[PDB]
Structure formats: structure tokens, C-alpha cells
Design an enzyme around this catalytic site. Sequence first.
Site, short mmCIF file in Angstrom:
data_model
loop_
_atom_site.label_atom_id
_atom_site.label_comp_id
_atom_site.label_asym_id
_atom_site.label_seq_id
_atom_site.Cartn_x
_atom_site.Cartn_y
_atom_site.Cartn_z
N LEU B 84 12.97 -10.08 2.85
CA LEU B 84 12.52 -10.84 1.66
C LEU B 84 13.55 -10.57 0.56
CD1 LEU B 84 8.67 -10.29 1.92
CD2 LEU B 84 9.96 -12.33 2.53
N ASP B 128 -1.14 1.68 -3.06
CA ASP B 128 0.13 1.88 -3.72
C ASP B 128 0.67 0.53 -4.20
OD1 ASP B 128 2.22 3.42 -4.78
OD2 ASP B 128 3.35 3.34 -2.87
N1 LIG Z 1 13.83 -6.50 1.64
C1 LIG Z 1 12.80 -6.18 2.40
C2 LIG Z 1 12.34 -4.85 2.50
C3 LIG Z 1 11.26 -4.60 3.32
BR1 LIG Z 1 10.60 -2.83 3.49
C4 LIG Z 1 10.65 -5.62 4.01
C5 LIG Z 1 11.15 -6.89 3.85
N2 LIG Z 1 12.21 -7.17 3.07
#
Ligand SMILES: Nc1cc(Br)ccn1
EC number: 2.7.11.22
Lengths: 259, 287
Positions: B84, B128
Site C-alpha cells: 500500500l 493499536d
Molecule cells: N507498505 C505496506 C506495509 C505493510 Br506492513 C503492508 C502493506 N503495505
Amino acid sequence: GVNEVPDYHEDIHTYLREMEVKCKPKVGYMKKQPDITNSMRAILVDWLVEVGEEYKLQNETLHLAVNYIDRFLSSMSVLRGKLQLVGTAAMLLASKFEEIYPPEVAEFVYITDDTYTKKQVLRMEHLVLKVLAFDLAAPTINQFLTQYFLHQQPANCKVESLAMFLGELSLIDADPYLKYLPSVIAAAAFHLALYTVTGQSWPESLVQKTGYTLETLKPCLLDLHQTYLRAPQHAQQSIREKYKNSKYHGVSLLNPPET
Amino acid sequence: SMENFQKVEKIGEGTYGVVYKARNKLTGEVVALKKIRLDTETEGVPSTAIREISLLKELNHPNIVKLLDVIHTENKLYLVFEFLHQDLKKFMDASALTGIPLPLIKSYLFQLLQGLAFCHSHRVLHRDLKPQNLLINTEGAIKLADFGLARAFGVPVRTYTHEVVTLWYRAPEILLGCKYYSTAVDIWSLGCIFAEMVTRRALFPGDSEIDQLFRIFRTLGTPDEVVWPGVTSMPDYKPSKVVPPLDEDGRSLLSQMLHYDPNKRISAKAALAHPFFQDVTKPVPHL
Ligand SMILES: Nc1cc(Br)ccn1
Ligand SMILES: Nc1cc(Br)ccn1
Ligand SMILES: Nc1cc(Br)ccn1
């Protein structure tokens, strides 16, 4: 109040029911284990009960552990001299999952009387995780009971205690209790206890929730009525021992009903 | 094992160790990998990872981060996650001068709640929720992430770990050290997060537990039995234009999320109806 998650209590029950089927051990697994038997499993579970009392673990920890074991032996041939290694690794895993303050690995090694090394425990840990594909969030008899308790009125200390006693006695005997789902055993344990201490049956409000009638719960209630009746003659005593104490209000000292 | 993954760059560090962005050489899928070192002579697989993995394997909702794989070695564990673009905190920071548009706020809060309601419906507390643990993509989605401090709860709830939720997002019933807490604490956190998206400063930025308490009281009103029946009996209890840009409905939802009493505090399920989300769309973010 919010501690009974009112807006979710139903979706959670439905989910647990769907999941208790996915996390169900193979009913016939012991006949396919060439080197171990229902009786050896009895000793194993009984020993786990004791460990949970010396380390003052949640009962929920004990249930998960036994789920982990049955699912593992449902997939993997195991020799007797390693049966304890599997069980120690499951208890360790169940503790890591469920406990706020799990015992360290060293205490899991200490309880085996150095039958096994730390490396073996830790390696068996990893193997158990791979075999279960990390599916540790298994519904237990207790997760159904704690929900089923909220349908009392008033609440009853002895009935709650007494129900857990029966639940734990089920974990010791693969035959017959592997062929019943947790939700079912939980229900059979709740009725029996209610009746014994009050004279009252599986209530209506729970019939609407579960779809389970006294008729549909008869087989289990029979098997379990037996277990309770034969309990003082069972080769395994650790549960009775454990429930003769104030914490559980000596419900193990109570005489079971006749029918 | 990771022969097919190519390291691209480090994207953060968490309880476990390092999170990296990688690319699948054969598929082109961009991923995030979480390297977890296994204590093979000492304490074995950390319970953090046992919980994160086991609970994420169950939760497959469009607003919960997707765990695509778990790659085992003798010594390491890699969790394979969908990639993401960034976390809400970086986005907020990027947006401290321009602001975040109200449509996008509305969409992010709607999604966060749909995500969270799924957790609660599946007996999982997140525990969290803060902007750093919420991930956004370029197509206008937001997702819950970092489920290492998460817990599968029973009904009713029993006593869980108290050291839970970063201070700023920690609900009053945890601060005051109440014996039992439940799905309400996640809502509090989201309420704190709603406020933050609107102002781009945190709502209750305390330096200490005591400062945190004072920060809440003065904003929502010194809690009393008439507002929070029980507040006076809580273990550690002792003797408006909070968000200018925000509409009448916005303000109503917020207060309901930030209710003192965990019993009177709105569920995620309830909140998904609140009029605020009657005109919700799915805008793209400016990044
Ligand atoms: N940038 C990211 C970090 C995690 Br943990 C999950 C997905 N994307
Ligand atoms: N050697 C053993 C094994 C178990 Br299981 C229990 C006690 N002693
Ligand atoms: N072996 C590895 C490790 C990372 Br992190 C990324 C790619 N390959």
C-alpha cells in the site's frame, strides 16, 4: 454492557460455529496412529491439566492446547516417545496465543524432566505451526460456555464451575468426545450442570440461539452423563483433583444425578 | 524461498524487525515483506507473530491488510503483504498545509469502520489503531494494518494485557486501569483518528498518563456519574469547536465515538449508519 459485545454477540457465535467445523480433528485419527492409543492421549491431556495448575494458566489455554494436539495427530504419525514433545509444544503455543504472561520456554523444558532438549521443544513448536498452517484461533468448549452462561438468571457459581469440570473431562477421552463439536459438548455440559445443582434444563433462549434441542443433544448428554458417573474410577484424576478446591467450589465433590 | 522476491527498499521497522518493499520477479506483484527473526535456541516464534499471522489468516476484508503468504526458513519468517503506497500519518503530514478534503475524510472513516466492524464480528480486538498503522493506496482505499498487538477475545471479555494502544489513542477505561475492556477501545482510537484527519494535529497528545487524562477531561468535559455512571468508582479516578471544519453530523458522530462510558460509546456497526455517511463517495487522494 460492552463487555458482552451486544451488537456482535450473534455474528461471533455464528462465526465460531463455522470455525469449530474447520478446526475439527479427524474423528478416526487414533486408529491410523500405529504406535499411539486413546489411553496414551488420556495420560497426555491429564498431564497438561496438572501443568496448567502449577503455572496457573487459563482453562482456555488448556482447551486450545488439546485442539492443537488432535489436529496435529490428525495429520502426522507420531511415536510414543515423542507424544509428550507434541503436547509440550502445543501447550507452549497455546500459552503464547492466549496468556498475558506465558511461561518461558525453559519452564516447558523443565516440566518434561529433561526428557527433551530446548532445541527439540522449539523445533517441535515450528513444526506444529507449519502443520496447522498457523490456524490457532480455534473455538473451544469454553468459548461456547462463557456465552451460554449469560443466559442464566440469576448467575450461579457452582453451575458455571460444574460445567467447566465436565468440559475438561471430555478433553481426556477421544472416544467418544472427538465425534462431538465443542458447541455441542458445551451445551451438554451446561444442561447437566444446571440440572444437578438446580433441577433446571437447557433454557429456551439458548434453543433459539443454537438450534440445539435436548433431543439433538441426547447422544452427547448420555456419553457425558456416563463420564461423570465413572469419574472417580477413571484412570485419570487430575481434573477431579483440581476441581475439589475452593476456586471451583468443590463441584467435583458433588454426587451426580441418577438420570 | 525468497529467490523470486527482489528487495526494493526499507519502508519501516516494527516490533519484529524490518518491513521492506519487494517485487515478485515472476509476477511483477509489488509486496511488503515483514522479516521476523526466530529465536531458535531461546524463545522460538514470538507470540506477536503467532497472533498477527493467525488472526490475519481469518480476516479477509477489503479494509484489512491482506497477508498473501508466510515463507518459512529454519531461522527467519517472512510475511508477504500486499503493498500500500503509504500510512495515514505520512499522508496527514503531507497534507498539513493543504488539508484533507471532507469527502475523503468521510470515505476514510467509513472504510475504517467497515474494516473494524469485521474485526469485532470475528472476535478480534486491534488494540493499536493509530494513523501509522492505517495504510492507503492511490485508488482511494484505506486499510487496518499491524495486527501484532491484536487479540482474539471471548464473550464476555476477560482480563487482557493492560499495556495496550499508543498513549495518545488509549481510551479512558485503559488509562484508569479498569479490569475489563472490550471493542469500545478501538472505537475511541478511531474517534481520535477522525478528529486528526480533520485538524491534522492529534486530539489528545499527552506526555504522561496523567497528562493524557487531563487532556481528555478538559476537552470532552470532566466526566461525572451523570455522563459516565461509574467514572468515580474507576480504579485511578480522582479529583464545542473541537474541530471547526466539521459539520453538525460530523460533530455528532465524533462525540458518540468519544463517549466516556464504554457502554454508551457507539459501536462500529451503529456508526456505519450515522447520517454523516449518507453521501459518502470514494475520492482518490492527492499524492
Ligand atoms: N507498505 C505496506 C506495509 C505493510 Br506492513 C503492508 C502493506 N503495505
Ligand atoms: N514421562 C512422562 C510423560 C508424561 Br506425558 C507425563 C509424565 N511423565
Ligand atoms: N531474500 C530476500 C529478502 C528480502 Br527482505 C527481499 C528479497 N529477498
